[PDB]
Each structure stands twice: as C-alpha cells, then as structure tokens.
Design a protein around this ligand. Structure first.
Ligand code: ZN
Ligand code: ZN
Lengths: 138, 101, 46, 198, 66
C-alpha cells in the first residue's frame, strides 16, 4: 500500500520510507539458503579421509565450544544454530605427501551472522568418495 | 460416408446426451492414469465422471453446491473436468455450452 | 547409541554403521539424510 | 461524548470539543502504548514440518492471546525463565498420521489424513504455580480458534512451547491491541442555493 | 508459502479467512462478493486473500512421507 508523498526528508534521491509495523507483521521477510559441501576421497595408496567424533572437555563432559553442534558421527546436526568459526565436518586427511598420521582440516562456518542447519545430505559417488552437503538457512 | 452403418462404431466411442454428443470415459483415462494436475495427487475413478454425466442425463443440470462431498473427491477434480464442457453461472453450477438440437 | 539416517526416496531408517557403500537397505536409493537433533533450540517470535 | 455503535470487538463514538493534539494522542496511545500479551520465546522439540522454524515462531508471535494484561508485570532484563507473575505458557503438540479407513478413490486430504491442518485450537494452556485458581477454565486461550499455523503430511510432527509476556506496541507490532484505531472530522455539506428539478 | 496471520497494513487477523474463502468460492460466489461476506472492508485486507498463492499445498507434494 503506497502513498506517494514527500515525508520526513529521508526520501530525497530514490530512498523510500517503510512502515515499522508492516515489517513486523511479515512484509519483506526473506530467507537466504547457502551451501557447504565436503568430500572424503579414497587415495591410490590404500588410505582414506575420516571424520573424527567430537572432542570432549573432560572437566565438564560436554564438547568444546568449537565442536558444540556436532553429532556423534562428527557431522553437524540439523536443527541447531551455527555461530562463527564453529566446525561442521570434523575432517582429517593423511599426510602421505609406517602407521598413518592425520592432520585436521575442519570445515568451519565462516560468516558474520548466525545460521540454522536445515538438512544434511550424505551420498557417495562410484569412486568410493563420500559426498556430504549441508543446507544453511538465515 | 456410410452414414448409417457407422453408428455401431460411433456408439463405442461417443453417446448422445441432451441433444449432443459427449465423449465416453474410456477415451480419456484408462484405469492406471496418474493425476493430470498439481496439488494433492488423486487416482482415476471413471464412474466418478460417469455419475456426473449421468446427472446431466436425468436432471436439467448439476444444480447443488457441494456434490464434491457426496462423491468425496477433490473440488479441484470436479471443477476442472466440468471446465472443458461448460461455462459458470452464479451459484447454479455450469451452463451447457450449446443449444438443444 | 547408533547412528540412524533417513533414506531419500522411501523415508526408512537405515543405521549405516560399518564402512559400506551408501545404499538404502530396502530400496536401491543411494542418498541419505540425517535426522533432526534432540537438543532444543530457542527462537524469538519476531 | 456520544457513543453511536458498539458490539463485540468494535466501537464507534464521538468526541466534541477536544482538539487535534489530544485526539491524536489518544490514537497514538491506542496504537503503540497500550500493552498486551504475546508470544516471544518458542522452544522447539522436533519440528519436522515444511514450515521453517523461524517462520513458525514468527507466525506464533502474531496470534492474539486472551490474557488480560492488567494482571501481569513486565519481565525484567534477562530472566529468561519467568515466573507466575509475569508469563504464560502454551504447548503445541501435533502429530500427523494416516486415516486407517477411507474410500478407495481417496482424493481429498480431509479423508486421507488426520491432524494435517494445525489450527490454533491445538494450543493447550499450561499453568504455572497458582495460575490455576487466579483464572477459571477458558479465560486463558487464543482468541480466534481457527487460525492456520502450519500444514502437515503423515509422518511430520510439530512440538513446541511458547512463553507469552507483556509488552507495548511501540516495541513490536504483535503487541498492538487494535486492528485499526482512527478518526475523522465530521462533515457538514451545506447547500448555498436551493437545488430543484432534475 | 502460506497465508499470513495478519494483514501487513492495518493488522486485522486475516489468517483464519482462507479456508472459508475457498469454501465460499465452492458455493460459486464472485471474489468481490465473498470478500464482502467475510467482513473485509478496506482494500489492504482484501488483497491478502485476493493476491495470495497457496504454494504449501503444492510444496507438500514433494515433501517426504511415510
Ligand atoms: Zn530407500
Ligand atoms: Zn488490512
């Protein structure tokens, strides 16, 4: 519903004034869906990437803050909110460049504002690679 | 054309109702067809059409508000099927599109 | 205690535990989805 | 003051002798400074509907609540639990299933499913402390009894917990007690010359 | 996706008029008569039902089910 008038002086060059009690009731409400995918490949050497579980705090028996939203299979769970620099997939790759040694390469949520996880997709290609996609909602 | 013998062919594919021909049910949908529209899917039920065209044979028209409750199926089926043969007048259903020859 | 995933086509619990190719136990569909968590989340009604 | 019409949920009346700068003040108080009770916190356990949780919380925020706001106090800064004095608490819990008996043609959703529409009659009030006796049965409810919230398919489930608090309309527009409050001056169309004929 | 609970402009609770609006269109009213019979005076409330598209009825076809 548009009234065409000169109001309040904040509408000089193409700027337009809105209604605060219309934005509260649902006008202009948008959703932004993003993506975060991670692959877990098998190498020519018989070694493979892996997802470790959440690393607990022994004094509190709760996970650490950077691993707060992870499920028991190392993958972030749908329904919970992510803040900045929390992990989503607890990946570990081999440094093959006798026992294999792993380094950590976690998929973390870079982003200035929070996001809710809606669904986590798990599928596999034909090359034994595991594909993991997350849908993120703001 | 052999315009006298051919009615034993035409009787199998069309039947005369209210002075005019009406397409028979088996031409449009055999009994395994999926819903042709969006919204909630529905299964085919040809007597759910044939009862409607039967009502046009006995009454003047289908004349009442809520036949979709009596026949249980979607309004989105009945009001879409009817829309290929008729035009709406206010409250009294649909109008038969061509005069009584 | 085990993990439970949801099939993409038929919506059945699969419980993928060992290192197996990702495949539904009942259909042949090869995409899984995680379940919703059991922890609560708190929203503002704004 | 001449009251000319009144029924349930409407009122029309006249004020003679007051000026614009006070009638406008009354309109602005009725829009933005008269407090009501509305949902602010929604605690979610297993939302599996297609409606997003933020959108669902936003829809549950705007439902008007029949609590009388002269009886409650403002929740303090912080204090995320809230007690008997300053909150109410509704519980929505709907599970959708298939109807085990239906016809074979089975087209409409009203025969195939049950609880596939979440109205606001599925909200059940949960008392706190002594609120069971300060209020009789039925005075704490949502008002409209028919507002669609979500809509489900069998297997999907909605279970949450609401926390109504007190707030004014200047803060957020779900606290406004009125649909629209306004006025107009009264017309006096006058005839300068006698109009006759056609 | 779904009918909003309130009108954006004034604040009348529109969100319970949708299932009744479809039922009055099943009784073969015109839209200008059904919107008057539901009690919508101003046009800001009338465009809430008049311009709404019910996408959740068709988005729920693609939702996963048992
Ligand atoms: Zn399957
Ligand atoms: Zn309005």
């Amino acid at each position: 519903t548009v009234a065409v008038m000169s109001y309040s002086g904040y509408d000089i060059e193409d700027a337009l004034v809105l209604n605060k009690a219309s934005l509260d009731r649902g006008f202009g409400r948008c959703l932004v869906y993003k993506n975060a995918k991670c692959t877990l490949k098998r190498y020519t050497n018989q070694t493979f990437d892996k997802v470790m579980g959440p690393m607990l705090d022994a004094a509190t028996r709760k996970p650490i803050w950077r691993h707060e939203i992870l499920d028991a299979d190392g993958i972030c769970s749908p329904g919970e909110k992510v803040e900045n620099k929390q992990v989503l997939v607890n990946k570990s790759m081999p440094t093959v460049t006798q026992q294999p040694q792993y380094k950590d390469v976690p998929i973390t949520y870079k982003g200035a504002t929070d996001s809710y996880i809606e669904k986590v997709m798990i599928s596999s290609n034909a090359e034994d690679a595991f594909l993991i996609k997350m849908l993120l909602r703001q | 054309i052999d315009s006298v013998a051919v009615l034993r062919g035409i009787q199998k594919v069309a039947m005369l109702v209210q002075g005019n021909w009406v397409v028979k049910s088996d031409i449009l949908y055999p009994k395994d067809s999926s819903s042709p529209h969006s919204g909630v899917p529905a299964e085919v039920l040809c007597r759910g059409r044939d009862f409607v065209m039967w009502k046009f044979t006995q009454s003047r028209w289908v004349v009442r508000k809520e036949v979709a409750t009596v026949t249980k199926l979607c309004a989105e089926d009945v009001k879409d099927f009817l829309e290929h043969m008729a035009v709406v007048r206010i409250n009294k259903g649909w109008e038969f599109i061509l005069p009584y020859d | 205690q085990p993990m439970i995933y949801i099939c993409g086509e038929c919506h059945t619990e699969n419980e993928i535990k060992s290192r197996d190719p990702i495949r539904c136990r009942e259909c042949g569909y090869r995409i899984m989805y995680k379940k919703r968590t059991k922890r609560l989340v708190v929203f503002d009604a704004r | 003051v001449d009251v000319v019409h009144m029924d349930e949920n409407s009122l029309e009346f006249d004020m003679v002798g007051i000026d614009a700068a006070i009638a406008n003040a009354f309109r602005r108080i009725l829009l933005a400074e008269v407090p009501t009770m509305a949902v602010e916190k929604v605690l979610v356990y297993n939302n599996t509907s297609i409606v997003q949780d933020e959108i669902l919380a936003h829809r549950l925020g705007l439902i008007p609540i029949h609590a009388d706001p002269r009886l409650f106090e403002y929740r303090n800064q912080g204090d995320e639990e809230g007690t008997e004095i300053d909150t109410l608490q509704f519980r929505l819990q709907v599970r959708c299933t298939r109807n085990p008996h239906a016809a074979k043609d089975s087209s409409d959703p009203n025969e195939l499913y049950v609880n596939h529409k979440v109205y606001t009659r599925h909200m059940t009030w949960i008392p706190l402390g002594n609120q069971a006796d300060l209020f009789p049965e039925g005075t704490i409810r949502p008002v409209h009894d028919d507002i669609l919230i979500a809509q489900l398919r069998p297997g999907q489930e909605i279970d949450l917990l609401m926390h109504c608090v007190k707030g004014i309309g200047k803060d957020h527009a779900k606290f406004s007690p009125v649909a629209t409050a306004s006025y107009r001056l009264l017309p006096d169309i006058t005839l300068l010359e006698p109009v006759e004929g056609e | 996706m779904i009918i909003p609970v309130r009108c954006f402009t004034c604040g009348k609770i529109v969100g319970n008029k949708w299932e009744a609006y479809l039922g009055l269109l099943q009784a073969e009213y015109t839209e200008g008569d059904a919107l008057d019979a539901l009690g919508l005076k101003r046009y800001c409330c009338r465009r809430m039902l008049l311009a709404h598209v019910d996408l959740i009825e068709k988005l729920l076809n693609y939702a996963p089910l048992e």
